[PDB]
Design an enzyme around this catalytic site. Structure first.
Site, PDB file in Angstrom:
ATOM      1  N   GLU A 126      13.706  -8.576 -11.678  1.00 30.76           N
ATOM      2  CA  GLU A 126      14.349  -7.346 -11.256  1.00 30.76           C
ATOM      3  C   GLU A 126      15.681  -7.355 -10.528  1.00 30.76           C
ATOM      4  OE1 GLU A 126      13.636  -4.718 -12.566  1.00 30.76           O
ATOM      5  OE2 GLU A 126      11.705  -5.320 -13.437  1.00 30.76           O
ATOM      6  N   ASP A 148       8.731  -9.989  -7.361  1.00 28.12           N
ATOM      7  CA  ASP A 148       9.528  -8.852  -7.798  1.00 28.12           C
ATOM      8  C   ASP A 148      10.445  -8.586  -6.633  1.00 28.12           C
ATOM      9  OD1 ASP A 148      10.503  -6.147  -8.251  1.00 28.12           O
ATOM     10  OD2 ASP A 148       8.831  -5.865  -9.646  1.00 28.12           O
ATOM     11  N   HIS A 207       5.030  -2.500  -6.396  1.00 30.85           N
ATOM     12  CA  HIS A 207       4.337  -1.790  -7.457  1.00 30.85           C
ATOM     13  C   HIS A 207       3.184  -2.625  -8.033  1.00 30.85           C
ATOM     14  CE1 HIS A 207       8.678  -0.415  -7.569  1.00 30.85           C
ATOM     15  NE2 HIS A 207       8.016   0.652  -7.157  1.00 30.85           N
ATOM     16  N   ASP A 221       2.406  -2.422 -11.537  1.00 33.16           N
ATOM     17  CA  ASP A 221       2.721  -2.761 -12.917  1.00 33.16           C
ATOM     18  C   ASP A 221       1.435  -2.929 -13.732  1.00 33.16           C
ATOM     19  OD1 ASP A 221       4.957  -3.072 -11.299  1.00 33.16           O
ATOM     20  OD2 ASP A 221       5.767  -4.737 -12.471  1.00 33.16           O
ATOM     21  N   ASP A 257       5.211  -7.478  -5.021  1.00 27.66           N
ATOM     22  CA  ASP A 257       6.017  -6.378  -5.512  1.00 27.66           C
ATOM     23  C   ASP A 257       5.584  -5.145  -4.754  1.00 27.66           C
ATOM     24  OD1 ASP A 257       7.239  -4.319  -7.018  1.00 27.66           O
ATOM     25  OD2 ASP A 257       5.806  -4.470  -8.640  1.00 27.66           O
ATOM     26  N   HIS A 282       8.043  -2.355 -18.080  1.00 29.29           N
ATOM     27  CA  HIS A 282       8.216  -3.105 -16.845  1.00 29.29           C
ATOM     28  C   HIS A 282       7.176  -2.646 -15.836  1.00 29.29           C
ATOM     29  CE1 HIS A 282      10.743  -0.060 -14.301  1.00 29.29           C
ATOM     30  NE2 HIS A 282       9.790   0.546 -14.989  1.00 29.29           N
TER      31      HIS A 282
HETATM   32 MN    MN Z   1       7.257  -5.329 -10.949  1.00 32.33          MN
HETATM   33 MN    MN Z   2       8.356  -3.310  -8.675  1.00 36.18          MN
END
Ligand code: MN
Ligand code: MN
Ligand code: MN
Ligand code: MN
Ligand code: MN
Ligand code: MN
Lengths: 308, 308, 308
Positions: C272, C227, C121, C123, C119, C136
């Site tokens: 996502e 993701d 990110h 998270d 991903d 999320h």
């Molecule tokens: Mn994520």
């Molecule tokens: Mn993400």
């Protein structure tokens, strides 16, 4: 030392149409004008005029086997003539099935040449393992020695002589291969570089190996057969079988820039440019200029500059 | 420790227009607002007001030599003042010809600085080897010591003092170099990284070498002169000389993120952002945000996160 | 050996809406039809029906903590059941907060699994260090053992049991991390691969290390939580938090193609995909096909071909 563009606006190779306009687009792109501007001399052979075999009956599945067998036979004839004179033969053409005549004719003068086939496909479908029948996907089949005899001879290709072994051909860019083709290449231990290997090793090492494989022992002549759909659609949209996650402009070039460096480029092959297949006139320019860029590259146009 | 944006909305450097709007776009992109948000303090010097030399007669070929010689002389004057105070001078500007005043002014306080010129061009055309006369392609010529004297002095640039040797400058991204420029760089054994070398070594090793070359012995101040057309058009379309197969977002960043890491960034240079040259308002955003991203990066904004 | 798609059209995870249509798009993209075409068997568990907790009062900041705690509790329940039968659980879902039930449920049968979280990110926002409250972005927080107790327990997630250590999870693709999250990962010495490390090492070496890190000693089961915003927006525009300079199609694939090779893929996670968030129906296809390509890849669809 000298170069010779041989237009080959053939098309019968596959269903969609608009590939015979390729030599037109490229040339219209001032291809020959920039190519002369290199430390090379250029002789345009002009476009070939292909006879269309009447009542061309689809042998088994293979569509237009005669017409295609013929138009190709003619190219080899012509490619063998210019090569016989010691000139690098660039072939501006339509579908890759015209690589049959290109290579063959090339192979006739230099039986020991090798092939660096850049494309996102294998084009090694035999008239048997082939789904539907568009010869633009069977070239490597008519040429590989290890394959001759493993499929019904086709009406119009008998003139061919399997001229290259699996140890003389290398693939670059693969990403959309069939079950059959995959089988065949795996079964014949052919050296290839799918987009996987590239992503891993980086185009840089791909060449060192493609070279240490083909030119390791002897240093024979090279036959680059560049299929335009080998470079991601973002660069060569004007083709018939676009496949994402392909080779980029900078990669297509590192490939050509390297082939120049060897000094063995004997015969080129710029296939599959289909002007008609551009959603916008822009897409056809993006394709035609990077098709050309590629050509110039194969002839010395380095990216660091070129002074006389 | 401190930063100082010096707008330089100059333009006479080249034919096309719309480059003076660069500091406006960038600033309008909240450049200074995000830059303060770094572990740095920012002083906006505001845009400079350039006097336009009347009857600026094209010296030989060189268009607007006076106006340009002057507007630049002013920048160095200003760049030397802020540097003299120990501040990193970011110069939001128009055409790269304004790199003359940037570097010069910079070089005046730190004669031993070095240059990492990121661009797809060499901008080393002397008022002689130059086709047509747009100074945005001659900077490196007015600055290189080894070049002074090899061309007719230009009306308005006499104030300059060749301040850097070919062993103090490195190129990154090159892909569209002329015959002359190629000659000159080859003739002066200048360390460069054309897109070829990048494609081969991978941006990662390009920095280790650009660094082991310039900062190997001593560890002098760095002058990054980032030309926006150094990153592929897909990222920086709003420029005057877009060239495909260029540096990508991730590469432009690895470059900046690395320059930050050294801790020697003394003077930056964000040139060639032309808002007007965007086919769609979107293209100007893609250019302005990744021009900014780049700046922030040169100041610590790592891609792994930044916590206070 | 067998596969089981578990639709998880949940959404409450974040503000924007349209993520529950993901399993619909993907399936509508003929996901299950191509997946069966692999050397695997597929059992579609069909979409789950989530109960929406009434008067879901935003615990502190955390929006919809109950509804979300619950919908997730249900998934784990279900993911634990199919895993308990020895089947690879592909979870077609909405927001990554549904990775809570995915992993947990997975972790229940194989406590020693490891996570390769791809991903842009982290998270890993705890209901405390989190700006605004969209779960999320908190998954890794509810799961990491080292984190339990460092934030107020949330209404509806108590059923969770931190099941993985920072030495069991690896990140790939990071590019937009917060101050808190950065702190937390740095503070816990978690192995990650921001787009910086990728740009440097090249996706190829990223896998060798991600593998030599997680599967070095023992060779436990793998939980890939992919993701979609991990691949550059140019490929997966239909998401909620698009970030430029991300992983490309060829990289997303080298990642999946490699996970297949290990033979340990136990539980996947395709989150996502937001159809609604496509500026043009095209963007939703570009996202849905490369989301699927990815899945297929995790199951053997190599880029060099696949023959039966
Ligand atoms: Mn994520
Ligand atoms: Mn993400
Ligand atoms: Mn082909
Ligand atoms: Mn092809
Ligand atoms: Mn420049
Ligand atoms: Mn430039």
């Amino acid at each position: 030392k000298p170069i010779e563009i041989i237009g080959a606006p053939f098309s019968k190779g596959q269903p969609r149409g608009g590939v015979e306009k390729g030599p037109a687009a490229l040339r219209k792109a001032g291809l020959v004008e920039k190519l002369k501007e290199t430390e090379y001399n250029v002789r345009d052979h002009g476009d070939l005029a292909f006879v269309d075999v009447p009542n061309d009956s689809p042998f088994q599945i293979v569509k237009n086997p005669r017409s295609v067998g013929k138009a190709n036979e003619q190219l080899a004839a012509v490619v063998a003539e210019t090569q016989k004179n010691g000139t690098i033969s660039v072939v501006l053409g339509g579908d890759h099935s015209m690589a049959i005549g290109s290579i063959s004719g090339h192979a006739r003068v230099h039986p020991d040449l090798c092939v660096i086939w850049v494309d996102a496909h294998t084009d090694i479908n035999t008239p048997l393992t082939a789904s539907s029948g568009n010869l633009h996907g069977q070239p490597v089949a008519f040429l590989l020695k290890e394959l001759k005899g493993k499929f019904p001879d086709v009406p119009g290709f008998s003139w061919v002589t399997p001229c290259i072994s699996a140890k003389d051909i290398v693939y670059i860019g693969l990403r959309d291969v069939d079950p059959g083709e995959h089988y065949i290449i795996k079964t014949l231990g052919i050296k290839y570089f799918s987009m996987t290997e590239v992503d891993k090793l980086g185009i840089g090492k791909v060449m060192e190996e493609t070279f240490s494989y083909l030119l390791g022992r002897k240093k024979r002549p090279i036959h680059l057969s560049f299929d335009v759909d080998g470079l991601d659609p973002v660069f060569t949209p004007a083709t018939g079988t676009p496949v994402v996650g392909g080779l980029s402009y900078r990669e297509g070039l590192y490939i050509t820039e390297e082939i120049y460096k060897t000094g063995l480029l004997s015969g080129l092959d710029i296939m599959e440019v289909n002007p008609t297949l551009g959603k916008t006139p822009e897409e056809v320019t993006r394709t035609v200029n990077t098709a050309v860029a590629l050509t110039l590259s194969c002839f010395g146009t380095k990216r660091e500059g070129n002074h006389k």
